[PDB]
Design a binder for this molecule. Structure first.
Ligand code: HEM
Length: 280
């Protein structure tokens, strides 16, 4: 058993946009790194119906590239508004130890909000990967707008997972006016603007209890005018896509890198990539 494994996560609230052609950058492969596990979460509209017939392109392009490197897809799950894919290096898998499971939780009767958790075991350690989506208008279990639900949190089980990641647009925003937020951005006072971020408020209500975010040192990833680096100040600039981590069993998870990918400008949000090292 290796003593450590590397995990990359990426999430993008990509809306109606199709998978780009350069995937290596998106997945953090472009520096020569070969991580053990890769999870990709997207949020948007119409993935299941698939009017545009993008599904077959996604499969082809992700499968070509990743199969080439020795990955196997453990699971792809899509609903109308969320997608979560998890890949693992083939060499790590043992069929009768894996216990691959996915639940979907749906909160509203239109099945647009909730989340997905995919869990699996390697080297006798359980990994769980969650993504979630909530809209501002929703009635929820928490009576907040945040994309949290206890059923999605595998640290609140009697047998909690060893390594947990929660990736996506949590529907946490910066709670101040757009002029002030832009001023802080222009001065590169990232910690000053993070003071207004709603994750700490959610945590005060004991949502995302004991989940940690890596230090943010990049500018808000939303809301941009498509194909520019210009903020549309009709919304307060915010950090939308986030990566949170936890261990249920006292394992060390060390973030190596956490950054937005500013080369991807096709849309209003920028994708966010995190890299972690975990000690088994
Ligand atoms: C940048 C945006 C997107 C990203 C990053 C992305 C990512 C992914 C990934 C990683 C997979 C699994 C591929 C595999 O099999 O290895 C997938 C599958 C799929 N995607 Fe995309 N996707 C995007 C956009 C979309 C859009 C806009 C639609 C439809 C409106 C869509 C529809 C689908 C469908 C239907 C599948 C499953 C196909 C099947 O199982 O036959 N995706 N996507």
């Amino acid at each position: 058993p290796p003593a450590q494994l590397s995990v990359h996560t990426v999430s993008w609230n990509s809306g109606h946009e199709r998978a780009p052609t350069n995937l290596e950058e998106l997945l953090g492969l472009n520096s020569g790194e070969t991580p053990d596990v890769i999870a990709v979460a997207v949020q948007g509209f119409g993935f299941q119906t698939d009017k545009p017939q993008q599904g077959p392109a996604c499969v082809k392009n992700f499968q070509s590239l990743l199969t080439s490197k020795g990955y196997t897809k453990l699971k792809n799950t899509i609903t109308e508004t969320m997608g979560l894919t998890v890949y693992c290096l083939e060499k790590h898998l043992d069929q009768n130890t894996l216990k691959n499971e996915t639940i979907i939780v749906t909160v509203d009767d239109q099945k647009k909000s909730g989340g997905i958790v995919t869990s699996f075991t390697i080297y006798n350690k359980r990994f769980s990967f969650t993504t979630s989506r909530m809209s501002d208008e929703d009635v929820t279990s928490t009576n907040t707008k945040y994309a949290y639900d206890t059923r999605l949190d595998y640290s609140k089980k009697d047998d909690p997972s060893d390594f947990l990641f929660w990736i996506g647009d949590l529907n946490v925003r910066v709670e101040t006016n757009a002029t002030h937020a832009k001023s802080l951005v222009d001065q590169n006072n990232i910690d000053g603007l993070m003071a207004f971020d709603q994750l700490k408020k959610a945590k005060e209500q004991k949502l995302f209890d004991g989940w940690t975010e890596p230090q943010v040192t990049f500018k808000p990833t939303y809301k941009f005018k498509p194909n520019t680096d210009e903020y549309d100040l009709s919304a307060t600039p915010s950090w939308t896509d986030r990566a949170l981590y936890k261990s249920g069993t006292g394992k060390t998870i060390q973030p190596l890198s956490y950054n937005s990918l500013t080369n991807y400008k096709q849309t209003e949000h920028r994708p966010v990539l995190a890299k972690f090292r975990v000690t088994l």
